[PDB]
Swiss-Prot record, chains B, C, E:
GO terms for molecular function: 4-hydroxy-2-ketopimelate aldolase activity; metal ion binding. Transmembrane segments: none annotated. Keywords: Aromatic hydrocarbons catabolism, Cobalt, Iron, Lyase, Magnesium, Manganese, Metal-binding, Zinc. This is 4-hydroxy-2-oxo-heptane-1,7-dioate aldolase. It comes from Escherichia coli.
Amino acid sequence: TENLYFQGAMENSFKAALKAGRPQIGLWLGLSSSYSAELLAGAGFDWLLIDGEHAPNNVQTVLTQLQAIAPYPSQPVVRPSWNDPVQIKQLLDVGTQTLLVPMVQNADEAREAVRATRYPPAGIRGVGSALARASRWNRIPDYLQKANDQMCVLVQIETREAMKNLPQILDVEGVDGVFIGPADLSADMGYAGNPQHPEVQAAIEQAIVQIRESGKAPGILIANEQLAKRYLELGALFVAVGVDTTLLARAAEALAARFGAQATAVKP
Amino acid sequence: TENLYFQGAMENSFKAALKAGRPQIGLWLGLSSSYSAELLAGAGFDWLLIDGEHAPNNVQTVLTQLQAIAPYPSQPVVRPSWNDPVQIKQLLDVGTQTLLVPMVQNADEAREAVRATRYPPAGIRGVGSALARASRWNRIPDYLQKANDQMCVLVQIETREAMKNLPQILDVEGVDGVFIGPADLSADMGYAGNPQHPEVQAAIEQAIVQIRESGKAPGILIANEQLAKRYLELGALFVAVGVDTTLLARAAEALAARFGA
Amino acid sequence: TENLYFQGAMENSFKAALKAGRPQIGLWLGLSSSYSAELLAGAGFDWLLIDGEHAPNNVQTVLTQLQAIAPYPSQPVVRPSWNDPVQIKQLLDVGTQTLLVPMVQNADEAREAVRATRYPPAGIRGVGSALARASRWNRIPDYLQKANDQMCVLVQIETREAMKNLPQILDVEGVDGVFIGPADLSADMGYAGNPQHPEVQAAIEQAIVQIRESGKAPGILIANEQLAKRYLELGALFVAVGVDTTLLARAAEALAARFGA
Amino acid sequence: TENLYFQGAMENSFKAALKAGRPQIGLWLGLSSSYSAELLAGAGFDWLLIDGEHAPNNVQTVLTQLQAIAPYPSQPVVRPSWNDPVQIKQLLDVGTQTLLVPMVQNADEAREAVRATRYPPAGIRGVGSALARASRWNRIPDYLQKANDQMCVLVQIETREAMKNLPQILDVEGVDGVFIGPADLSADMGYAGNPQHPEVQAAIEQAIVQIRESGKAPGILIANEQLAKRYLELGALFVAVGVDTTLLARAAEALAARFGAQATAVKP
Amino acid sequence: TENLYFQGAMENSFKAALKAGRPQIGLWLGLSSSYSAELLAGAGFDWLLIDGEHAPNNVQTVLTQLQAIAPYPSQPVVRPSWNDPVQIKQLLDVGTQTLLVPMVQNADEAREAVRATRYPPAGIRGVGSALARASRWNRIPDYLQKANDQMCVLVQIETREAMKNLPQILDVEGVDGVFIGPADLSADMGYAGNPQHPEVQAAIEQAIVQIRESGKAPGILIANEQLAKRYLELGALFVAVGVDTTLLARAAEALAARFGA
Amino acid sequence: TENLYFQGAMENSFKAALKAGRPQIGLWLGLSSSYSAELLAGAGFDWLLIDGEHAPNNVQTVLTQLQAIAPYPSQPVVRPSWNDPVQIKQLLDVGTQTLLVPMVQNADEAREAVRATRYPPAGIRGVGSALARASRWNRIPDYLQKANDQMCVLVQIETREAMKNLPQILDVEGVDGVFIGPADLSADMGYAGNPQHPEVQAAIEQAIVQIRESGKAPGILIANEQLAKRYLELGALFVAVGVDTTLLARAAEALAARFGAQATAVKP
């Protein structure tokens, strides 16, 4: 049963789903806790984004979240704080197989992200650290030969520059998906982070269509359910539909307001 | 400003609200994290219960959640894992002023809980450690003289025996409130933690009435608005209306379901 | 897949193996780390003992080691620091289903350990916290109804007194297994923790025979292959065959020595 | 009362004091603990420096120190380990509003530090992560519109090069203060980290005067009380007058020596 | 060098100094941090008290502070949160050799504290875990045979009752020292923790004299040089002369005040 | 005795041994725990490598491992995640004296690593942070004057490029040792991380010889005992002969298999 566990441990199920065109519904994890990560792994999402960029996580807290999520069907995706080969290698070492790389502005940057995930001759990943959690400390059979094909690289586009360069980014082998950051894009476009303007929505919708038609997976984070459904209709394949901190804050506020109202009606 | 900060830090605002008969709406905290504690401290609850009994908290995690909540209006209440004077001493040292003590079965046990929170001659609290976070390392003026009156002891009744002893429990000086846990009571009564039976509900309602009419604050953990209003109309004063882990799981699941994940 | 995950999470596979009479080979975990726990969970042991008694673990570190081990076939067993119902409640809340309870001296103490793991009417476990990791925050269907039967209580006998009381201990319903710690027994018997004396070995062997013949599982911690086979031939069912700290120190020292460091 | 809390949470009180010319007396925090941070927040300092450069802190320990200090009147300032926009954004995300940026050598570097703290069009800060502790998870009203003006950027000058470039650094909009590192400056000047030589003191004093006369706030760390008072007389506005580790070590040593002397007098 | 390291690690240098009648100057550690513990280990104190009773420490933080202090000449003493054999066992396992046991009221309790630190037949310490940090994972040669004699048990007297029982406490074999906490005693005596009353001071001085004249070491926590010299002249042998949290707060405040912050 | 402790604390014993030509046998630490570090410090190795590159460590966990190891005879060496002066300075601050710097490709990079460890005029280390654990919070007498000479810089060569540049790397003053990464070298040479090919072994053996004959210390990590002995015979001076995670995994698997076999023989 150890044998079968390790055989099964290599396959990147999120990647397989993207390649099959199966839309994957996700939740962003900013609570930076292995405890809430496990709780949320039971909620039914296809994927969970462990945010190493804008939540107080580091390689060690990423590791404990991966350990928490492991037995659940929900698949982990990890965002490093930047497109940094050193950060990427440390994340791969602890077992990350799907990366959401921020601030990818052009094809050279996209290529650098891909190369950081692949062993020679395909990239610059060091074979010497294969013995970490990535290969389960040398228990996954034929790990070195199998690893490159199971890496899934998703690049974020969040500026006018990146949109301009989207066709060349799409041409990069090993870019499996392209994620759009709508608030950052809006801000770069002069709309102050409010994506609900025609010019911003036009840019977003056109990019989703272009990514999908290039044979790659479009992604986006959108807390507005109606917009999320629109992006799915346009062929988006990895759509994060909320953020754990927001879900918690908004549910808690709604609860305090409703019951607070009851206390006030009894004791004016 | 420091002097004014410290002069203000001593007052137990939760206790003052209970004594004024102002109902207090609370949320249970089982996420055992200073980060979600701060986030939830901004949501608008009157009180937050840092659960040391059934969440993976210890004195250290209670400390950081107290630090996180401190600047917010929401008031922290801590549940130790048992009515243990040592555990109570440690929670007080880190700055806990309102305790929710589990499994208080009789007046002797209620008295023991109270005595654990009070300096001599009123109790057995060791003055040794006035110098911990409780006195802000000896910055709160007249701390020793002021501390006993700002302690707020709430006792849990969870069994048929505790219910039988309620009148005697209510007579214990220093018991400020009595909390009923409907699930545990239902379980002890034979209804497998399902509180939605007339016999359980009858026992709960009568207890709330007795507690309030004795001049003490009734508390309860509930999830239904209409039942909450009913317990409020019957005099309940510290009503916890959800649990952080549950709120998060249910919101998350509802969201995933809306997309057919 | 979530529904199927949760339906499967309830079953105590270790308990099922003991009841089927399948010997289970274990490793003691004293490294008190979720990282080495995961590494060791892949090594091929049937069970891993997360030691809360003689390693620097607490409920929080037990939790993270349970999360680390979860996806592997190796089954976790947790040793609390004492036969304490509060500590037992907390370990159960974080998801412990198999307990190794130290210093059980008599049937009363064995019964107390069992009762601590069971909901009413079978025990004193508080239903209050079905909602912790134990029920996966209320996702495991019919958790309350199913939990008691999946709890596995193993009691340690460490003294001459415990040995004298063994027949009565074996009669306690809900005692699934009895573990003998050869070092502590040897110490109590006057042999300074050296178990390699006929009198100690005679006492150990007879206990294993009595336990198995009563229909319960014998357990022991040993390091020698031939002695392990002997205890297995005598009916032992949960045999721990090393300790992580020892394995690591001895491997490290042997390596350094081979280079004349 | 939540409402009023969040309204009050936005204002950078340290910045306001600097702009008003009110000298601010500070303590350096290198103990890297939220517990001693809270203790020291009660001591009466105007500001506390959470040192992310030369103490064993990271974004997560910075967060817990900010949470500890929050209810006290003492204001937190955070030093990142370098002038790195990625580190700066993570610090801003967890709620940092005043940054002390090390090793700023020229105006381009000073400009880069400022831009890392401001949303478009003023800088390169991403609006997408406003939902972290910075906006108290979207509770601070009009956070995006208010954030830029409450950021306070202090740049360190600690080399001959930086002194040479001081006039241009002073010309950078959004540089609110310039901190002098006297030991590093001394070392760069050939005086081996001992600042008590005329040439080093001349450089330091002249820079304080120049910074203040440019309309900006001078800062410095100085454990020598007499020098601290001199720098204040010259118009310095954020003066750190000790370091927690040093205060603890020196107080402890003095205590052991005095009582040790007593034990020795009784038992020669 | 390893063999020589381990041969040297067993010796309790603090105990040896007390037995030689060499006064030992100490600092209380409440900062609950391995980093400040190391810093303070270099300051020149003979001993450092890692407070498990009134600081937010647990067995894990005690462990890291022991590791931090280890290479320095200053010797660690640990205060458990209570006279609890389980807590004592856990502290010993991580390598504690000198215990300061709070709230020892009578000889029975003193004997219980001693017995908790000793292997059979001298006590009830479980040999099971010689293999933890205490034996350096079985590297200290002849650990089991040597451990009992290197344990140093110091008991706290905090009440009028404990004072009455002092003669009997002093007669307990294995009580190496008796510590008086002036604040708690003052509190029990009716003086609200203010030890600067003749009646309290009279009781303290007489106790120090009785302890030393019985052949045991007196200890106390004080802050005044002249009072320290007086207690030293009266025979005190382990004198704590400040508290880390207090030293830091007072130094910090004095500094801020000098600049009119 | 404090005095004598601090006098003794400055000397880098690992460096002294390398300079004396005494071979030093090491173990790699990837378990990222101060508890197992202390355990392993008692095992008899000359040195222990605290891996900040490919294990889930950070400056703070490095600090706790240094504190754990301190009283033992085994000497700590720390690998930062990259040749980064900011990371290097933080490691030096917490008391690191021997650094194993990854991915050093040429002499300029080797020089940069050395300079990051030395105070002016020899390098760019800041004197201002000498007051951290490095000087034991200002207790080590004459720390500033003594520090440079006790720093020990070991550079990793792990590519064909680095091998090409080895003669120039050897010429860099302050490079005390050169470590060869055999699996990474093999991968860069087209042999897929398996070092057991003649061309890879020829490269490795020749480099060891060249490093030693230049008057510098050769190093390598090799879990194969027979190869380790060959490299020692060729004059290697710091040879890591295993990895803690591997030793633990392999010992545990052997144990489970042997006793599992016994259970199976009793209960077929």
